[PDB]
Amino acid sequence: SGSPLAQQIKNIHSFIHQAKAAGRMDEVRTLQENLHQLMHEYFQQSD
Amino acid sequence: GSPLAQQIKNIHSFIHQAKAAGRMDEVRTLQENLHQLMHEYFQQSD
Numbered sequence A: 001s002g003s004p005l006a007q008q009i010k011n012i013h014s015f016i017h018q019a020k021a022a023g024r025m026d027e028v029r030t031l032q033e034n035l036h037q038l039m040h041e042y043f044q045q046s047d
Numbered sequence B: 001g002s003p004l005a006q007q008i009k010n011i012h013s014f015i016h017q018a019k020a021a022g023r024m025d026e027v028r029t030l031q032e033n034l035h036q037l038m039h040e041y042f043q044q045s046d
C-alpha cells in the first residue's frame, strides 16, 4: 500500500519548488525543515 | 525497497551514525548528497 507519508513528502517537496518559483524564500526555508523532518521519520526502521 | 529508495534510506542511516560519532564534516557532506538524491527521487517526473 502507498505510504501517505511518502505522498506528504512528495507534496511538500513540490510545494517548496512552487514557493521558490514565487520568491517566497522564508516559507521555503520553513518547509525545508518540515521536509527534512518527514524524511527523518519515513526512513526510520519498522523492525 | 526499490534501489534508489534504499539508497536514500542508507544515506540517512549513515547521517545518524556520523552524528553519533560527532563527525560534523562527514554529516554535512552526507546531507548534501541526501538532499540532491531526494530531489530526484521524490520529484514526480514525466
Ligand SMILES: [Zn+2]
Pocket: A039, A040, A041, B012, B016
Ligand atoms: Zn534522520
Ligand SMILES: [Zn+2]
Pocket: A013, A017, B038, B039, B040
Ligand atoms: Zn527539489
